[PDB]
Design an enzyme around this catalytic site. Structure first.
Site, PDB file in Angstrom:
ATOM      1  N   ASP A  29       3.539  -8.448   6.143  1.00 43.44           N
ATOM      2  CA  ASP A  29       2.156  -8.125   5.576  1.00 43.44           C
ATOM      3  C   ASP A  29       1.046  -9.201   5.928  1.00 43.44           C
ATOM      4  O   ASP A  29      -0.021  -9.394   4.923  1.00 43.44           O
ATOM      5  CB  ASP A  29       2.337  -8.332   3.953  1.00 43.44           C
ATOM      6  N   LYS A  69       7.691   3.012   5.529  1.00 48.51           N
ATOM      7  CA  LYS A  69       6.695   2.861   4.343  1.00 48.51           C
ATOM      8  C   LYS A  69       5.889   4.089   4.362  1.00 48.51           C
ATOM      9  O   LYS A  69       5.075   4.460   5.421  1.00 48.51           O
ATOM     10  CB  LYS A  69       5.972   1.726   4.448  1.00 48.51           C
ATOM     11  N   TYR A 126       0.851  -1.293  -0.002  1.00 47.98           N
ATOM     12  CA  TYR A 126      -0.028  -0.095   0.088  1.00 47.98           C
ATOM     13  C   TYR A 126       0.665   1.269  -0.072  1.00 47.98           C
ATOM     14  O   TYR A 126       0.332   2.477   0.534  1.00 47.98           O
ATOM     15  CB  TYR A 126      -0.859  -0.198   1.275  1.00 47.98           C
TER      16      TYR A 126
HETATM   17  C1  LIG Z   1       8.263  -1.099   6.013  1.00 49.60           C
HETATM   18  C2  LIG Z   1       7.170  -1.922   6.351  1.00 49.60           C
HETATM   19  C3  LIG Z   1       6.083  -1.669   7.116  1.00 49.60           C
HETATM   20  C4  LIG Z   1       5.102  -2.664   7.299  1.00 49.60           C
HETATM   21  C5  LIG Z   1       5.168  -3.982   6.678  1.00 49.60           C
HETATM   22  C6  LIG Z   1       3.989  -4.994   7.073  1.00 49.60           C
HETATM   23  O1  LIG Z   1       4.155  -6.145   7.193  1.00 49.60           O
HETATM   24  N1  LIG Z   1       2.902  -4.467   7.515  1.00 49.60           N
HETATM   25  C7  LIG Z   1       1.879  -5.117   8.073  1.00 49.60           C
HETATM   26  C8  LIG Z   1       0.524  -4.931   7.887  1.00 49.60           C
HETATM   27  C9  LIG Z   1      -0.011  -6.161   8.224  1.00 49.60           C
HETATM   28  O2  LIG Z   1       0.772  -6.740   8.800  1.00 49.60           O
HETATM   29  N2  LIG Z   1       1.888  -6.332   8.450  1.00 49.60           N
HETATM   30  C10 LIG Z   1       6.297  -4.381   5.993  1.00 49.60           C
HETATM   31  C11 LIG Z   1       7.208  -3.323   5.735  1.00 49.60           C
HETATM   32  N3  LIG Z   1       8.546  -3.643   5.273  1.00 49.60           N
HETATM   33  C12 LIG Z   1       9.784  -3.948   5.690  1.00 49.60           C
HETATM   34  N4  LIG Z   1      10.956  -4.228   5.256  1.00 49.60           N
HETATM   35  C13 LIG Z   1      10.937  -4.010   3.842  1.00 49.60           C
HETATM   36  C14 LIG Z   1      12.173  -4.359   3.328  1.00 49.60           C
HETATM   37  C15 LIG Z   1      12.227  -4.249   1.724  1.00 49.60           C
HETATM   38  C16 LIG Z   1      11.042  -4.132   0.868  1.00 49.60           C
HETATM   39  N5  LIG Z   1      11.282  -3.871  -0.546  1.00 49.60           N
HETATM   40  C17 LIG Z   1      11.991  -5.153  -1.131  1.00 49.60           C
HETATM   41  C18 LIG Z   1      12.462  -4.886  -2.454  1.00 49.60           C
HETATM   42  N6  LIG Z   1      11.039  -4.847  -3.142  1.00 49.60           N
HETATM   43  C19 LIG Z   1      11.291  -4.554  -4.485  1.00 49.60           C
HETATM   44  C20 LIG Z   1      10.019  -3.715  -2.572  1.00 49.60           C
HETATM   45  C21 LIG Z   1       9.682  -3.708  -1.057  1.00 49.60           C
HETATM   46  C22 LIG Z   1       9.845  -3.619   1.472  1.00 49.60           C
HETATM   47  C23 LIG Z   1       9.841  -3.847   3.100  1.00 49.60           C
HETATM   48  C24 LIG Z   1       8.445  -3.621   3.970  1.00 49.60           C
HETATM   49  O3  LIG Z   1       7.536  -3.356   3.244  1.00 49.60           O
END
Ligand SMILES: Cc1ccc(C(=O)Nc2ccon2)cc1-n1cnc2ccc(N3CCN(C)CC3)cc2c1=O
Ligand SMILES: [Cl-]
Length: 350
Positions: A159, A49, A31
């Site tokens: 996620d 994020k 998102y």
């Molecule tokens: C920053 C962050 C915030 C939240 C969540 C999350 O799981 N939220 C939820 C909602 C319900 O349960 N869990 C995950 C993240 N998060 C954390 N670390 C990351 C590290 C790398 C990346 N990138 C890696 C390379 N991709 C191309 C794009 C996404 C992406 C992330 C990444 O998205």
């Protein structure tokens, strides 16, 4: 209040506390955009994020609330947790952005194996999963790209709980077809926590072999690839299928025999083959759980009853409500305001 500062990053504007520095894009997360940053408070590397229009709709607004509640409650080594949450808005009235802060793991399973790597990683997912299942949260779209890993092969599930619960709502979440339990793809019998277990199956298959177990080109082709392996259901599974059309596809697609998993995963650890056989079954009533999988011989090396803990009671009655965007927006905000960082002791991590 923190000193905030601003920059444009791939056509977006980020406003963030001065404590996070070296913002560096790494692609989309769920998102919104994600930036690697360095955390001056703690010396830690972190992922930030920016949510994309967190409140342009009830869909966005509820989903923002969901994400923040989920993140705030998870306290488990193998489950991603909330390191910080912030907004530049100094009041509810101009509350328009939410940024979430987590640890920055090297990579994910999509990027990155001997049997011992396979035991360890799968063990971790299953440990993590047990913790989410126990709080009655189902991932619903477990897959390699949401399994973040260190260079220590340490792992954190990301996620979970975002993919739609039902036909009847939409969360704007995109699942990946290849790792989905048949019963949630075709909605063809009732479904429980063990949909994630099916996903763990497809993942573990993929780690050992290097190959996507079921790279279906659509729902039906996928169903076809699955049934070539696990074999067409018998009378005993068929009687559990509500949808009459879902039965027609099964009874009609030339009856596929169940294969010998030893021939399919040849050269693999035999205990590894046996766990796959308990994981890759169509009947969601008979599929092995997270907790039962933890005790399977295959994990004799990493297994410990008193070190596979379960979550505190999680309130998710918010999930049943129909509220205005302004009601979700306010609730998210109060969660923002109430937020206290995890305890940071004398020790230095990473
Ligand atoms: C920053 C962050 C915030 C939240 C969540 C999350 O799981 N939220 C939820 C909602 C319900 O349960 N869990 C995950 C993240 N998060 C954390 N670390 C990351 C590290 C790398 C990346 N990138 C890696 C390379 N991709 C191309 C794009 C996404 C992406 C992330 C990444 O998205
Ligand atoms: Cl899943």
């Amino acid at each position: 209040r923190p000193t905030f500062y601003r920059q444009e990053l791939n056509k977006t504007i980020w406003e963030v506390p001065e404590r996070y520095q070296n913002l560096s894009p790494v692609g989309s997360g769920a998102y919104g955009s994600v930036c690697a940053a360095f955390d001056t408070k703690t010396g830690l590397r972190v992922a930030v994020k920016k949510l994309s229009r967190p409140f342009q709709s009830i869909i966005h607004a509820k989903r923002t609330y969901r994400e923040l509640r989920l993140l705030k409650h998870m306290k488990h080594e193998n489950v991603i947790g909330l390191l910080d949450v912030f907004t530049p808005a100094r009041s509810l009235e101009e509350f328009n952005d939410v940024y979430l802060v987590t640890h920055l793991m090297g990579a994910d399973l999509n990027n990155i194996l001997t049997d011992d790597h396979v035991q360890f990683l799968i063990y971790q997912i299953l440990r993590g999963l047990k913790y989410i299942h126990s709080a009655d949260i189902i991932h619903r779209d477990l897959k390699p790209s949401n399994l973040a890993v260190n260079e220590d092969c340490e792992l954190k599930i990301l996620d979970f709980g975002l993919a739609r619960h039902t036909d009847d709502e939409m969360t704007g979440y995109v699942a990946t077809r290849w790792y989905r339990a048949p019963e949630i793809m075709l909605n063809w019998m009732h479904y429980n926590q063990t949909v994630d277990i099916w996903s763990v199956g497809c993942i573990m298959a993929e780690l050992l072999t290097g190959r996507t177990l079921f790279p279906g080109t659509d729902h039906i082709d996928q169903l076809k690839l699955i049934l070539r392996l696990v074999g067409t259901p018998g009378a005993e599974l068929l009687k559990k299928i509500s949808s009459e059309s879902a039965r027609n596809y099964i009874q009609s697609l030339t009856q596929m025999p169940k294969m010998n998993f030893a021939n399919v995963f040849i050269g693999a650890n035999p205990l590894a083959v046996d766990l796959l056989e308990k994981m890759l079954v169509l009947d969601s009533d008979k599929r092995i759980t997270a907790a039962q999988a933890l005790a399977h011989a295959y994990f004799a090396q990493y297994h410990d009853p008193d070190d596979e803990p379960v979550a505190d009671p999680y309130d998710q009655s918010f999930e049943s409500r129909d509220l205005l965007i302004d009601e979700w927006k306010s609730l998210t905000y109060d969660e923002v305001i109430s937020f206290v960082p995890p305890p940071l002791d004398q020790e230095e991590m990473e």
